[PDB]
A paper describes a structure:
Animal mitochondrial gene expression relies on specific interactions between nuclear-encoded aminoacyl-tRNA synthetases and mitochondria-encoded tRNAs. In this study, we focus on the mitochondrial serylation system, in which a single nuclear-encoded enzyme, mSerRS, charges two distinct mitochondria-encoded mtRNASer isoacceptors. Both, mtRNASer(GCU) and mtRNASer(UGA) have lost the identity-defining long V-arm of the canonical cytosolic tRNASer, and each possesses an unusual secondary structure: While mtRNASer(UGA) adopts a non-canonical cloverleaf fold with extended anticodon stem, mtRNASer(GCU) lacks the entire D-arm33–35, making it the shortest and most degenerated of all human mtRNAs. In contrast to the principle of unimodality found among canonical aaRS-tRNA recognition systems, human mSerRS employs a bimodal recognition mechanism, in which it uses a single binding surface and substrate-specific induced fit to specifically recognize each mtRNASer isoacceptor by orthogonal sets of identity elements.
To understand the molecular basis for mtRNASer(UGA) recognition in human mitochondria, we reconstituted the ternary complex between human mSerRS, the seryl-adenylate analogue 5’-O-[N-(L-seryl)sulfamoyl] adenosine (SerSA), and a stabilized mtRNASer(UGA) transcript, and determined its structure at 3.6 Å resolution using single-particle cryo-EM. Docked across the mSerRS dimer interface, mtRNASer(UGA) establishes interfaces with the active site entrance of subunit 1, the ‘C-tail’ and ‘N-helix’ of subunits 1 and 2, respectively, and the helical arm of subunit 2. Both active sites are occupied by a SerSA ligand, but only one of the two tRNA-binding sites is occupied by a tRNA. The mSerRS-bound mtRNASer(UGA) adopts a non-canonical L-shaped fold, with acceptor-stem-T-arm and anticodon-arm-D-arm domains arranged at an inter-domain angle of ~100°. However, in mtRNASer(UGA) the additional deletion of A9 in the linker between acceptor- and D-stem results in a shift of the entire D-stem by ~3.5 Å (one stacking plane) toward the T-arm. This allows G18 and G19 of the shortened D-loop to form a canonical elbow structure with the T-loop, consistent with earlier chemical probing and NMR data. Thus, mtRNASer(UGA) is bound almost exclusively through its acceptor-T-arm (‘minihelix’) domain, similar to the GCU isoacceptor. As for the mtRNASer(GCU) isoacceptor, mtRNASer(UGA) binding induces a large conformational rearrangement in the motif 2 loop in the entrance to the active site, which inserts residues 334-340 into the major groove of the acceptor stem and forms putative base-specific interactions with C74 of the CCA-end, ‘discriminator base’ (G73), and the first acceptor-stem pair G1:U72.
Residue numbers in the entry:
A (entry chain B): 40 to 121, 130 to 333, 338 to 503
B (entry chain A): 186 to 393, 398 to 507
RNA sequence: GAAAAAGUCAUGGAGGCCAUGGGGUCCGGGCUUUGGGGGGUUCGAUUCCUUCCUUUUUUGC
């Protein structure tokens, strides 16, 4: 067990994470209460040890600084003086003793700092007072748009509709792409591309900046984003260490954008700078069938960096949620906006807002988009600072929203626009992209298996 | 290795043409400095007009093919070793160009090095109808490559680990004439796309493993001063079918090995290198071609209004 | 993707601070130029060993 951020700080790749433990060090009761409500990896029965280690590290650092000051002073004195002089011999002996003490105290301090940082990086972020407490069951409802479409017959599943239209293939795909795979064909791919282009244009029309991030990122970006690349119960893919070392797959475009903005200032006049990026995302994830839970899936994520004020960050998150609601209303999908609890917020999240669409074929609502606001978790981890008009650097805020997810959107559209005959209608916004008012049966003949 | 056609002309400028990287860095559309730890070496970060250019080049050819009749199909990105070996790729060796997944976490999982393998796996052990032929399917996906040429042009976008490619696969009948005509159609389609974009290119026939014929299209690059391959259409007569047991049901009903044809529609790295080095201006501007004007929205690219991102890291002179 | 060389205004020596060639300001003269980052030997390491990064040489798909 180790931490990539500490390794980078040790090797000099980046500065040491400037944690805000002191923010709550003055009132351990509030921090313990928040940790208990979040119920993260770290419990409330281990904070005192972390504080004790931090205090000991501070004292050792102070003693080391004092010793370094004395050594520098004696070295300067020797330099200004410049063998048999008793003063020279005394200074040499004092320097030897100081060096011995420094080498004796250095490993102790290094081990203490390593332990303290490895125990402190596991702490979660703050929580908004308006965020309800409890499990997923305690999800507050904020807005409900649309209604459940009325069906004159039993609605069929999304997988069944896709197999009938020959647009989504999932049978006998083990030897092709492992489990939880699919092959979008025809109208399925056309609908996916239309949705992606529509979302991209709608986002570019409101001032957003398009971007493109890689898919193979190092574990450092994930650790700074608040993830666990190397872990037994992890779900993030990892390339072969023999072929490449310290390389991981991009779980989401947000990680790529954070890596891009890592160690880079932003102009105050340019802030808030928002960037939308559409790319594929892979997740091990190790329902039993369908496109609900898949490994690889296309997605467009919006990352915004605003000023330091919480009012500005809140307004940015509100704007993102409003844009997502307008996109869903434009596409014609019945959904509900929920407020995630403290136990499901996450490590870096502070105020998460999820969106659940109505899936008649599934029989219940399903999450199809999420948005979160992190005040300083990412900035303090990746050292994402920003300068002001004067010239001082301050940690900026970061908000990450999911513009659209093709798997859940396709599931919702196929289960909502279905018909009695078997066709699926198209919304009034993607008709231009699809070139068809409705999706009829396919003209080509499906493939027949002739293998073992 | 013999050239067959040559369309277009080399641009003319009153100054020494600059490189694509220099223009991108000046306009701040791409970034490649200080990314060894973020996304490894050789990793670009497109922004501003760069992303709009990529989307334009990934939605122009796709739409053009969709208007001529094409069956779009989205393929996966995590293929198995069987599909890779069936195509003719051997990731078992150490100096391979296919990213291998950790065997401890997964078993026999390999990253998709290109969309060709993904489109080939769709027909693995599946008989296609006779009337459906010819079956053409375009697929735009991200392709990763483990090995790059570091010695030659290391600081550049020519050879990058990950890119966004758009391939065009085609399944034809058992007759070689049909496969040849389909390859000719694909070549003419890509040539028309290149001409519409306004890029000077040259098509050539490579000499002489599993592919029977390979047509390579190399675009002009004033900044580099030498042509560069931008596409390569290969024609495998029966290697893919013989390795993957791909067949088709004829009229009589007997199973036969079907001919496969694959061709690259467009590569974003090379297309943007050609566009940046060809449409160069005196003040670093970049004129948008007459086809991507509707997508980019700007008749002439200019310097960005926002301030570029500085560096506040330890690796800097203080 | 691998192996090798250099290292910050340039050349050359110098672990206790430089010679020459340089850049800018002021009256040929004068002022003035601390070396890319993180680790070890040392009383003090821009100089001895190692690592990150920038540049350069060989091999290869
Ligand atoms: N294993 C998965 N398979 C398919 N789709 C998924 C999977 N996990 C999440 N999604 C989809 O992607 C959306 C993104 O929400 S999220 O993963 O929990 N949050 C993020 O990705 C952060 N980068 C902020 O957006 C989900 O709402 C859901 O629609
Ligand atoms: N390392 C690379 N980095 C970026 N782009 C590449 C790279 N290698 C090939 N390409 C792009 O892909 C095109 C086809 O070359 S190829 O990858 O070797 N051949 C194929 O992909 C086959 N599927 C032919 O359809 C090239 O012309 C170039 O545009």
């Amino acid at each position: 067990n180790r931490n990539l951020l500490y390794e980078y700080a040790r090797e000099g790749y980046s500065a040491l994470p400037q944690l805000d433990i002191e923010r709550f060090c003055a009132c351990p009761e509030e921090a313990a209460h928040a940790l208990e409500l979040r119920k993260g990896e770290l419990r409330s029965a281990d904070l005192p040890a972390i504080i004790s280690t931090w205090q000991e590290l501070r004292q050792l650092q102070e003693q080391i600084r004092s010793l370094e000051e004395e050594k520098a002073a004696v070295t300067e004195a020797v330099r200004a003086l410049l063998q048999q002089d008793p003063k020279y011999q005394g200074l040499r002996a004092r320097g030897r003793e100081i060096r011995k003490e420094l080498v004796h105290l250095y490993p102790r301090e290094a081990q203490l700092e390593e332990q303290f940082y490895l125990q402190a990086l596991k702490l979660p972020n703050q929580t908004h007072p308006d965020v309800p407490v409890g499990d997923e069951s305690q999800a507050r409802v904020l807005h409900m748009v649309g209604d459940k479409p009325v069906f004159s017959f039993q609605p069929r599943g999304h997988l069944e509709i896709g197999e009938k239209l020959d647009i989504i293939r999932q049978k006998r795909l083990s030897h092709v792409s492992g489990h939880r795979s699919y092959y979008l064909r025809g109208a399925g791919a056309l609908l996916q591309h239309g949705l992606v282009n529509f979302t991209f244009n709608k986002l570019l029309r409101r001032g957003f900046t398009p971007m493109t991030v890689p898919d193979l990122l190092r574990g450092a970006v994930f650790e700074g984003c608040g993830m666990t690349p190397n872990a037994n119960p992890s779900q993030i893919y990892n390339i072969d260490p023999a072929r490449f070392k310290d390389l991981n797959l991009a779980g989401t475009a947000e990680v790529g954008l954070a890596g891009y903005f890592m160690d880079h200032t932003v102009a105050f006049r340019d802030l808030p700078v928002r960037m939308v990026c559409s790319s594929t995302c892979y997740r091990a994830e190790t329902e039993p069938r369908g496109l609900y839970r898949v490994h690889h899936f296309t997605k467009v994520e919006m990352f915004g960096v605003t000023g330091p004020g919480l009012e500005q960050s809140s307004q940015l998150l509100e704007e993102f949620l409003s844009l997502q609601m307008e996109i869903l209303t434009e596409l014609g999908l019945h959904f509900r906006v929920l407020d995630m609890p403290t136990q499901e917020l996450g490590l870096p999240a502070y105020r998460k807002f999820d969106i659940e669409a109505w899936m008649p074929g599934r029989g219940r609502f399903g999450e199809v988009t999420s948005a979160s606001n992190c005040t300083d978790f990412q900035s303090r981890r990746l050292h994402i600072m920003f300068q002001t008009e004067a010239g001082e650097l301050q940690f900026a805020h970061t908000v990450n929203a999911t513009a659209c997810a093709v798997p859940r959107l396709l599931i919702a559209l196929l289960e909502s626009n279905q018909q009695k005959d078997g066709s699926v209608l198209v919304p009034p916004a993607l008709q231009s992209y699809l070139g068809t008012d409705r999706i009829t049966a396919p003209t080509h003949v499906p493939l027949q298996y002739i293998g073992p | 290795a013999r050239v067959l056609h040559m369309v277009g002309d080399k641009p003319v400028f009153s100054f020494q043409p600059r490189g694509h990287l220099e223009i991108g860095e000046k306009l701040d559309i791409i970034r490649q400095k200080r990314l060894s730890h973020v996304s490894g070496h050789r990793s670009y970060y497109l922004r501003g007009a760069g992303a709009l250019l990529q989307h334009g080049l990934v939605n122009f050819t796709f739409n053009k093919l969709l208007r001529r009749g094409f069956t779009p199909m989205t393929v996966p990105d995590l293929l198995r070793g069987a599909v890779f070996e069936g195509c003719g790729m051997t990731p078992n060796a150490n100096p391979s160009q296919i990213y291998n997944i950790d065997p401890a976490r997964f078993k026999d999982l390999n990253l998709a090095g290109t969309a060709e393998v993904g489109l080939a796996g769709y027909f693995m052990d599946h008989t296609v109808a006779f009337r459906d032929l010819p079956v053409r399917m375009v697929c735009s996906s991200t392709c990763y490559r483990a090995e790059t040429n570091t010695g030659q042009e290391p600081r550049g976008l020519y050879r990058v680990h990950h890119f966004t490619k758009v391939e065009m696969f085609g399944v034809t009948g058992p007759g070689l004439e049909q496969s040849s005509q389909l390859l000719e159609e694909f070549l003419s389609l890509q040539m028309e796309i290149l001409t519409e974009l306004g890029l000077h290119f040259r098509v050539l026939d490579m000499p002489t493993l599993p592919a029977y014929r390979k047509f390579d299209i190399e675009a002009w690059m004033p900044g580099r001063g030498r042509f560069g391959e931008v596409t390569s259409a290969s024609n495998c007569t029966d290697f893919q079918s013989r390795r993957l047991h791909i067949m088709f049901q004829t009229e009589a009903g007997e199973l036969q090995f079907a001919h496969t044809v694959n061709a690259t529609a467009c590569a974003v790295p090379r297309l943007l290198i050609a566009l940046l080095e060809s449409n160069q201006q005196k003040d670093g501007s970049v004129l948008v071609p007459p086809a991507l004007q509707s997508y980019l929205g700007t008749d002439r690219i200019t310097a960005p209004t926002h301030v570029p991102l500085q560096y506040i890291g330890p690796n800097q002179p203080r």
